[PDB]
Design a protein around this nucleic acid. Sequence first.
RNA 1: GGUAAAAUGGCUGAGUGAAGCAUUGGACUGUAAAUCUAAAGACAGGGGUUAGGCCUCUUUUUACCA
Length: 668
Amino acid sequence: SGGPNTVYLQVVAAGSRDSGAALYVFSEFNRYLFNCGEGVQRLMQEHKLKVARLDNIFLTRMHWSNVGGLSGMILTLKETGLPKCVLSGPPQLEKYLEAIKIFSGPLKGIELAVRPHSAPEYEDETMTVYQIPIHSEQDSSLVVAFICKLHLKRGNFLVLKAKEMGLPVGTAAIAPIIAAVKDGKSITHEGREILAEELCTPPDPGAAFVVVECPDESFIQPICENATFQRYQGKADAPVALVVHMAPASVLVDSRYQQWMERFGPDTQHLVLNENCASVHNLRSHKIQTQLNLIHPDIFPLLTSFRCLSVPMVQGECLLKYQLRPRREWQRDAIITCNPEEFIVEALQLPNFQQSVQEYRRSAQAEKRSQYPEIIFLGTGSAIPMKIRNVSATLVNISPDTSLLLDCGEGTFGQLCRHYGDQVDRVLGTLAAVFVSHLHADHHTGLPSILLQRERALASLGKPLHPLLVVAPNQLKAWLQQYHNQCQEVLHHISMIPAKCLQEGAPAVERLISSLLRTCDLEEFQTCLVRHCKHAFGCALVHTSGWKVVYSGDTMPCEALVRMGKDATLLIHEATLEDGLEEEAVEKTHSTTSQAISVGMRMNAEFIMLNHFSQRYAKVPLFSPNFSEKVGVAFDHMKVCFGDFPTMPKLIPPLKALFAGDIEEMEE
RNA sequence: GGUAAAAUGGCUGAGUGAAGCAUUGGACUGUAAAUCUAAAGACAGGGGUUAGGCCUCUUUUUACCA
Ligand SMILES: [Zn+2]
Ligand SMILES: [Zn+2]
């Protein structure tokens, strides 16, 4: 068979601040993805991108912005069931996939293949790419740029022209004639010879595109007029169709360079991706957030708006696909821009929703509570981000000066971005400590994303370095050490704390826990084992003023949690099914909503928050009846103070009305 | 919400083009059941490749998701 009939280039990352570079090219036979960071897990599977058929994955640089997201792809492939896959990258990239099995578990069932730098050539039936390793004085010094090529395309045969002369078109005799013409050998028929160009268009060798990743001036000198480029710059076998520059805007304006790119010729198109892009590609999420704000602006805050030299450049944006083989031109028929003026149309006119909203407002229309005890909910999914659900983070802000994290995950940084707005830089500075509940990957894979950005935030205002405090099981230390020794230096920003020492009845550890307690003004900190998995642990917070909150998360009912949870103003509990099957508890290793409600009733706590929900089937939580005002429903991007309890019970009717039709488990 | 198998008629087996059971008048049979020389409904709804078999976007059915 011949080469692909159509080739499309698609942009995934779009140069967003919350994620690294990422480029997607669609081919008739194979799917290829270049580079990927954190937050892409939603970008794909939200814009209808097929996970399957991604047998080949490519990436650049070892930094988390381009290697962090591989765990999600591996997990999806394991769930998807793809038989084989191929992964390529820097020579020392095998160490990254060596340590994934530590917590993600064995990858047996799907085969992954890697290759060294000794084989810089790879070919298949529809495409070919050449990789050029690059060495720089100032592994973070290797970026290995990529080059792409396309197989020759055979010009369409003129079957109608053959029929006009008198050839036996429409039968089995024409097939050998067209097959011979395809090979390029003329055939003489009826005493006359017909040239190939007469019966078909001239062959086209095929276009190509190049990708570069110059991050700073360290890599400019090694790449300056590279030998490989001299054999392809300017006129070549075919003109260059498109080019993408991942370099930052600062590198663009430098006097040096900015002229080599022009050597490719005016016909060569160029693109730039960087943080200055307007983006705004959260249509459905933004609509849901606006609806929640309309229900009650105070309870549910609103996301902030993230808004925006010899040849022209088309700034990259959302789903700016490019067409290669049919014709070299751009397409913008899939623009994804938020339109609140359209969101309000359906937010203020849902069936019976307006009546419930107005009734709740009239009903709403007991002394002032404490001003700045704050708990913020970031994510309410389970190990799989989706339209409106993602791995939970449970941001807590005990005081404006000091902040704490109730576990963390991937995509939480993107969530708090476009939300805190200008205050994002200040919020990260207030962060003083973090910790992990159990060994699940989704609960600890988000630490690097927060840490690397907090490192920049600390210097953004010229404050002294303050290493972050991390409390996680002793197993998490191995992965952190491997990453420190393999990809980038992060040890100085993390201080491990075993959770065993915090158990009831159990110099560096004591001084560090004392510093944590005094910095955030916490009277005491306690942790206990949970019936969830090996080395699983919980936590409890008690304030000097008598406020107590205990986080349980994934856990089966146990006596220790109940004993520690006695006289607790608030607590976070996990739900799996609401109403349904009570069997196969061992498979889930999680509590049940009815049992959670019973516990909360007997917990003596005045209110119980339901945050973590299983995401096997996309459905709003069908709240189990036989409950009280103590229980509640927790979603993403929530706000209020400690004493703002009486508000949320009245939000139940409007909250249910907003969803209207519910898509829950059916007999199928 | 995601993954896996079929969209051909009253039913099924496939991709050179379509075939058996059944029927419209019945021939051997007083009798309407046995055996045909003719008949018919015909590959879900779009398009990219210029041909069906390939891929792509909804629609129906079944199963699975830790
Ligand atoms: Zn969980
Ligand atoms: Zn978990």
